[PDB]
Amino acid sequence: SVSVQTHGESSLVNKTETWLDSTKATRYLMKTENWIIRNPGYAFLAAVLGWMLGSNNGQRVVFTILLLLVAPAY
Amino acid sequence: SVSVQTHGESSLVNKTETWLDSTKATRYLMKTENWIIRNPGYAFLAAVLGWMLGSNNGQRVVFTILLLLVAPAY
Amino acid sequence: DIVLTQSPASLAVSLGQRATISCRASQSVSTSYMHWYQQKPGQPPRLLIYLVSNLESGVPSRFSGSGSGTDFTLNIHPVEAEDEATYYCQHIRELTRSEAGPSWLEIKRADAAPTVSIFPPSSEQLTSGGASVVCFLNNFYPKDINVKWKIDGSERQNGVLNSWTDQDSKDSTYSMSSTLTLTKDEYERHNSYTCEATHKTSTSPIVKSFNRNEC
Amino acid sequence: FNCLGMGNRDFIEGASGATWVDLVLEGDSCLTIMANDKPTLDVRMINIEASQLAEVRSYCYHASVTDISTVARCPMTGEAHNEKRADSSYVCKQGFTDRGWGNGCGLFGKGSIDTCAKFSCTSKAIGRTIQPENIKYEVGIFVHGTTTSENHGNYSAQVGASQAAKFTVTPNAPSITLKLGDYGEVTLDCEPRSGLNTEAFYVMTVGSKSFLVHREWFHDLALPWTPPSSTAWRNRELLMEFEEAHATKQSVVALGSQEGGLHQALAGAIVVEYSSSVKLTSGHLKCRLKMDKLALKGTTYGMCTGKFSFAKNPADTGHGTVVIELSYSGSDGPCKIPIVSVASLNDMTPVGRLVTVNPFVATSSANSKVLVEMEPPFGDSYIVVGRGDKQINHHWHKAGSTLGKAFLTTLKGAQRLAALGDTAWDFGSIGGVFNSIGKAVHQVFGGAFRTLFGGMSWITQGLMGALLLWMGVNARDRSIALAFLATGGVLLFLATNVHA
Amino acid sequence: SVVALGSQEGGLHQALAGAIVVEYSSSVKLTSGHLKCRLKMDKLALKGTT
């Protein structure tokens, strides 16, 4: 549809003010943050799954911070 | 914006034909499949990351099939 | 798929007065994509307005207009004698590209009555076997006019050849020439020949008559 | 056409050794060439022009429902057929109506209906496809002679002095030779076809304005579209919907105008205007500047014998140089204008270099304004105009000292490496060996790797890079950089390049 | 050049997914009902066994 699969980004030459540039940073995060605020109860058990498996410490967060970004808009 | 963060789903009572129902199944997959077809070269190295770490077999795919869904529309 | 029509098809207005053309486009939301062409008879036109806000190179700043979607306008506030022409327009977006039924500019003046002169056929044409009775209507305004060939008090529409000019360059009036063509034998079997010219100026038709028995 | 007051002004340091140089230019940026025996040059793109554009297809974003027709039938009758399925203008769809004995039928639980609605497009977008030969490039070229605040920013004025020129390079005629008059002739050999990629994208018209879109994404747009000629469209059912079926009543409703959604579908698209010929803002073109017949006249001149004055006060161009305009009141002209850039007043040794080489008085007329630019060194310097006691000087200081400037070359150099693809090494001009293999190593690296997974948008390749940086943490000896290869650079850089 | 976005009506229809289509004339008529009622059959009886 027209809602998703935007032209962005051209990335050919293009040093200029495009149609939407400064709003491109607000595409995902804010809409995904509005999703995780929409569903806080998920966010509590979300990061729990990272500490469950692998016992490798620092890469357990690699699960969470990536997986917490999966659930919004699938 | 109006493009994302749709009303769907109400999920209160609502046994009826809604505004958009049959098209709700085509929201993510088809647009994410059009993304992975857009970027096949990523899909080759994408699933490679799953077989890299953990040596636990079946859960290595849990990385990929989840991570290959992350990249489309972030 | 789109139908275009331009109105008024003929507009009589004095120079310097604003002329705003009521127009439209049938297939809707053309965005702007509408133009204006001025064409004198027997010439190619000239593009007046493109982008609907913008002139071409040669066209002076007196031309303007606005619109979107269906309706569009050509607004010339200082119309001039150089603006005298047949105004055309044309569309874009969908295809095929087509124009509208055009509109004429006419410079307004006082309504003038025609000078009617009906000439009997020459002696050279009679000897050729035919007879063409000609009726000249000169310097009449506006263009609305009618000629009726009354032979012995009866109107004949056969052999009637009507040649009239456009709006003149000098006095900006119209001139018409009507021609009644007959054979010499048919010419000599009919006596009274007259062309009555009715016009908006004269409430009665202007009657110029001659008989073959007369002179 | 010139580099005066442009947003991006970059320079060229002449090493001589050759009269030809291969440089890439842009619409916004203006290149400035400074070489021995060759005066100071301005090379920039005005815009990108295209002559003939074919019509690829169109898209109807806004539609309206007309003539809703639903033919009701009984259960067990199978398919329902409305007579409107003959014309393609009518949008027909199967369906059913649950029937009782109360409404229209003698059976229960099922039904069949054919719902047809005539399609009417209120508004439609149109795309364009670019032909390679039709692409034109208007490249402003300028050489710095005696100039004022008027003529220097003026084209036709410097054409009378033959110091500025315009021209159109096309695939049919990529080579153009233009004469600078008193300073000789220059030959410019461009690559119009290969400057951009003509078939990489289309030109989409949304409403009145037109915009650029990738052509592979152009066909992948989900919205009712149109064949070039006239009539029969595809996927026109997407702008319309259906409802429940009560007896014969079902309402086909049309979606509103998708123009906003098209403007939402446009993000990195470049705004492009047009009149007779489309003018693109950001240029990419590969040209060859041949300076062989460009030379310096007036080797026999001498210094001016009389007082100077400031027509305008000095300032900083922001690009690292200082320009001044001088009104010379002396009548001894034509004469070579004495001027320098010095460290201290007690030291007459020139340090800073003149941006505009060989300042010269046009005519003997007194109070003739002359605009000459110079590049002072870093730190406290002085602009000294003239010799002997009638010189009038000025103090200048520039904090851009080579420490930070080394990064301005480095950091922007990597920025020059980004977004220019394989052409980024054309700043390696009069190259070979290093510069040749430097592009060649990046050639296949530009034809693979970054372009293979290319299409990533902002944080998509940026976020995973931070996770790919973790791949450098877990590794083995001699295997360290293997997982670190694509991580550092080429990935996080462009993510830091565009923030925002 | 300040340029305006097009009509977002489609985006509003895109923003609508689980929304129920509702008509109206002088009083709005909602399709799917939810109501809690108490049916008292005390006076309801059978006649006519005669």
- Domain contains C1: no
Chains that touch D (3 or more CB pairs under 8 A): A, B, C, E
CB contact under 8 A, D459 and B39: no
3-state secondary structure of B28: coil
DSSP string, A2-67: -SSS------SS--S--SSSGGGGGSSHHHHHHHHHH-HHHHHHHTHHHHHS---TTHHHHHHHHH
Separation of alpha carbons E22 and D243, rounded Å? 11
Q: Chain D: residue nearest C27 by CA?
A: D122
C-beta neighbour count of C175 within 10 angstroms: 18
**How far does the CA of residue D4 sit from the closest CA of chain E (Å)?**
23
- Judge whether D239 is closer than 8 Å to chain A, CB to CB: no
- Domain contains C54: yes
- Judge whether E5 is closer than 8 Å to chain D, CB to CB: yes
DSSP state of C123: H
Q: Are D77 and D45 in contact (CB under 8 A)?
A: no
**How far does the CA of residue D171 sit from the closest CA of chain E (Å)?**
33
Written as six digits, the tokens of D269 are: 């698209």
Tell me the chain C residues in contact with residue D55 when contact means C-beta distances shorter than 8 Å: 95
| Type of residue numbered D403 | L
- Domain contains C76: yes
- Domain contains C90: yes
DSSP state of C213: T
Place of tokens 């041949």: D290
- Domain contains C63: yes
CB contact under 8 A, D500 and A6: no
Last residue in a domain, options C59, C92, C108: C108
How many CA atoms lie less than 13 Å away from D166 in the CB half-sphere? 14
- Judge whether C94 is closer than 8 Å to chain D, CB to CB: yes
Domain of C19, CATH number, reads 2.60.40.10
**How far does the CA of residue A41 sit from the closest CA of chain D (Å)?**
25
C-beta neighbour count of B17 within 10 angstroms: 15
**Strand D112-130 with D392-398, pairing:** unpaired
Whether residue C33 is found in the same domain as residue C81: yes
Nearest Cα neighbor of D216 from D129, D134, D123, D125 is: D129
C-beta neighbour count of C93 within 10 angstroms: 21
Question: 1-60 in A: which are within 8 Å (CB) of D?
Answer: 1-3, 5-22, 24-25, 27-29, 58-59
Written as six digits, the tokens of D384 are: 């000294």
Q: Chain E: residue nearest B20 by CA?
A: E17
Contacts of A46 (CB under 8 A, 6+ apart): A64, A67, A68, A71
Nearest Cα neighbor of B49 from B35, B66, B37 is: B66
Whether residue C20 is found in the same domain as residue C64: yes
**Strand D135-143 with D41-50, pairing:** antiparallel
Query: Burial, C55: exposed, middle or buried (Cβ in 10 Å; 0-12, 13-18, 19+)?
Result: middle
Q: Which of A5, A8, A18 sits opposite D220 (nearest CB)?
A: A5
Whether residue C87 is found in the same domain as residue C134: no
Separation of alpha carbons D412 and D406, rounded Å? 10
Tell me the chain E residues in contact with residue D257 when contact means C-beta distances shorter than 8 Å: 6-7, 9-10
Contacts of D231 (CB under 8 A, 6+ apart): C1, D88
Tell me the chain C residues in contact with residue D205 when contact means C-beta distances shorter than 8 Å: 31
Whether residue C118 is found in the same domain as residue C25: no
Last residue in a domain, options C108, C131, C159: C108
Separation of alpha carbons C29 and C26, rounded Å? 9
**How far does the CA of residue A3 sit from the closest CA of chain B (Å)?**
5
What determination technique applies here? cryo-EM
CB contact under 8 A, A28 and B73: yes
Q: Chain D: residue nearest E21 by CA?
A: D243
**How far does the CA of residue B21 sit from the closest CA of chain A (Å)?**
15
Tell me the chain B residues in contact with residue D216 when contact means C-beta distances shorter than 8 Å: 38
Whether residue C113 is found in the same domain as residue C86: no
Contacts of E11 (CB under 8 A, 6+ apart): A3, B1, B2, B3, D260, D261, D264
Q: Which of A13, A16, A24 sits opposite D284 (nearest CB)?
A: A13
Q: Could you give the dihedral angle defined by the CA atoms of residues D62, D65, D66 and D68, in that order, rounded to the nearest 10 degrees?
A: 160
Interface test with D, best of E5, E7, E12, E20 (most D CBs within 10 A): E7
- Judge whether E13 is closer than 8 Å to chain B, CB to CB: yes
Whether residue C41 is found in the same domain as residue C68: yes
Separation of alpha carbons D121 and A35, rounded Å? 36
Instruction: Give how many domains chain C has, as a whole number.
Output: 2
Q: Chain C: residue nearest D57 by CA?
A: C94
Whether residue C30 is found in the same domain as residue C98: yes
SS3 readout for chain D: CCCCCCCEEEEEECCCCCCEEEEEECCCEEEEEECCCCCCEEEEEEEEEECCEECCCEEEEEEEEEEEEEEEECCCCCCCCCHHHCCCCEEEECCCCCCCCCCCCCCCCCCEEEEEEEEEEEEEEEEEEECCCCEEEEEEEEECCCCCCCCCCCCHHHHHCCCEECCEEECCECEEEEECHHHCEEEEEECHHHHCCCCCEEEEEECCEEEEEEHHHHHCCCCCEECCCCCCCECCCCCECCCCCECCECCCCECCCCHHHHHHHCCCCCEEECCCCEEECCCCEEEEEECCCCCCCCCCCCECCCCCCEEEEEEECCCCCEEEEEEECCCCCCCECCCEEECCCCCCCECCEECCCCCECCCCCCCEEEEEEEECCCEEEEEEECCHHHCEEEEEEECCCHHHHHHHHHHHHHHHHCCCHHHHHHHHCCCCCHHHHHHHHHHHHHHCHHHCCCCCCCHHHHHHHHHHHHHHHCCCCCCHHHHHCCCCCCCHHHHHHCCC
Whether residue C87 is found in the same domain as residue C125: no
Q: Which of B5, B34, B70 sits opposite A5 (nearest CB)?
A: B34
CB contact under 8 A, D455 and B45: no
- Judge whether E16 is closer than 8 Å to chain D, CB to CB: no
Contacts of D155 (CB under 8 A, 6+ apart): D1, D140, D164, D166
* Phi/psi-derived region of residue B73, left when phi > 0, alpha when psi is between -120 and 50, beta in every other case: left
Last residue in a domain, options C108, C140, C174: C108
SS3 readout for C2-66: CCEEEECCEEEECCCCCEECEEEECCCCCCCCECCEEECCCCCCCECEECCCEECCCCCCCCECC
Q: Which of C28, C29, C95 sits opposite D229 (nearest CB)?
A: C95
Whether residue C31 is found in the same domain as residue C121: no
Whether residue C97 is found in the same domain as residue C158: no
Whether residue C97 is found in the same domain as residue C137: no
3-state secondary structure of B59: helix
C-beta neighbour count of D136 within 10 angstroms: 19
Q: Which of A1, A7, A62 sits opposite D213 (nearest CB)?
A: A7
**Strand D58-73 with D90-93, pairing:** unpaired
3-state secondary structure of C207: strand
Strand order in the sheet with D379-385: D340-342, D379-385, D392-398
Separation of alpha carbons D26 and D270, rounded Å? 14
CB contact under 8 A, E32 and B13: yes
| Type of residue numbered C162 | N
What residue numbers bound the domain in which C21 lies?
6-108
Resolution in A: 4.7
- Judge whether D362 is closer than 8 Å to chain A, CB to CB: no
CB contact under 8 A, A31 and B5: yes
Whether residue C94 is found in the same domain as residue C156: no
